């Protein structure tokens, strides 16, 4: 649908780190976000272009537990369209969510994941994570960083899956407030 397509065009970029291929969401200005396990370095390949990462901060919850979200500042020639207003104030569930994926290997894809329900605790590959949500869809490898959306709202970042189920880190507006 319209919102999704626009989001892909204006905000979602194919990326590559030493950990592999990832989908990346640009939020505003030169601020972007990745799944923590992508482990961005001093630099990253964005659309086949070697870009400098200026800042990299990993998000943890009130008790210091991993949220699986890394916020990076980019050395870039342009600014991302500002979508903070499409991100809810509170981590929000959803009904018929589209998972937007875009890596060099899985380009410009819209995956129908169904209902997104509140999960919470998640053992992601041996690393404890909080503030996760879940969808019943056979999610596969290479989809991490994928953007979960529904009716104009950007609500989560795909971080992993167990074969029958997919999991995303929830998105709150507060994660992205100015600098």
């Amino acid at each position: 649908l319209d919102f999704a397509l626009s989001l892909l065009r204006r905000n979602i970029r194919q990326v590559q780190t030493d950990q592999g291929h990832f989908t990346m969401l640009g939020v505003r200005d030169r601020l972007a976000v990745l799944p923590r396990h992508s482990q961005p370095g001093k630099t990253i390949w964005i659309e086949h272009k070697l870009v400098n990462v200026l800042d990299a901060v990993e998000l943890v919850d009130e008790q210091g537990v991993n949220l699986e979200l890394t916020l990076i500042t980019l050395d870039t020639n342009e600014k991302f369209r500002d979508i903070t207003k499409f991100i809810p104030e509170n981590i929000s569930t959803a009904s018929d969510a589209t998972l937007v994926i875009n890596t060099e290997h899985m380009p410009s894809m819209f995956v129908p994941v169904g209902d997104v329900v509140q999960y919470g605790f998640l053992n992601l590959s041996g690393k404890p994570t909080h503030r996760t949500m879940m969808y019943n869809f056979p999610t596969k490898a290479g989809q991490a960083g994928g953007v979960v959306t529904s009716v104009g709202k950007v609500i989560g970042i795909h971080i992993g899956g167990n074969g029958r189920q997919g999991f995303c880190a929830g998105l709150k507006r507060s994660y992205f407030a100015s600098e």
């Binding site: 990993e58 998000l59 949220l67």
Partner: peptide, 7 residues
């Protein structure tokens, strides 16, 4: 080591 932030 990573720079952290409580959110």
């Amino acid at each position: 080591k990573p720079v952290l932030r409580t959110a």
